[PDB]
C-alpha cells in the first residue's frame, strides 16, 4: 500500500456497540494498550453516535500513530486476526484527514 502516519481499524466496530459507555471504554482502552505494543500511539479517534447522532458514517475507527515505522509493524500483525468473530481489516490513514475526521 503506502505508509502515511496513522493506523486504520475497520471491520471491528458496530454502531450498536459504540453507543454504550461500557462497550466504548472497553474498545478505546483495549485498542490503546494493544496499539501501544508495537510503538507509540498519540491518540485514538472512535466515533460515538449520540443516541444515533453520528450513525450515518459510524463503523470505522482508528488511532493516531507517531511514526509509520511502528504503524507498519503494527498493522502487519493486526491483519488476519479477529476482534471477536470477524477478521479485522487494518489499513493506513492520513494524519490530515484524521484531524478533520474526514475519515479516509
Amino acid at each position: 500500500g503506502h505508509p502515511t502516519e496513522v493506523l486504520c481499524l475497520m471491520n471491528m466496530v458496530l454502531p450498536e456497540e459504540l453507543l454504550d459507555d461500557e462497550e466504548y471504554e472497553e474498545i478505546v482502552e483495549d485498542v490503546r494498550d494493544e496499539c501501544s505494543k508495537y510503538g507509540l500511539v498519540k491518540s485514538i479517534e472512535i466515533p460515538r453516535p449520540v443516541d444515533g447522532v453520528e450513525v450515518p458514517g459510524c463503523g470505522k475507527i482508528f488511532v493516531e500513530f507517531t511514526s509509520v515505522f511502528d504503524c507498519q509493524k503494527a498493522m502487519q500483525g493486526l491483519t488476519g486476526r479477529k476482534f471477536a468473530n470477524r477478521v479485522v481489516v487494518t489499513k493506513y490513514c492520513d494524519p490530515d484527514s484524521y484531524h478533520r475526521r474526514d475519515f479516509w
Partner: peptide, 13 residues
C-alpha cells in the same frame, strides 16, 4: 495499565 491479559481481542479460530 489493565486489559493486557484476560480477554483475547485478536483471535482467529
Amino acid at each position: 495499565p489493565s486489559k493486557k491479559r484476560k480477554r483475547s481481542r485478536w483471535n482467529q479460530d
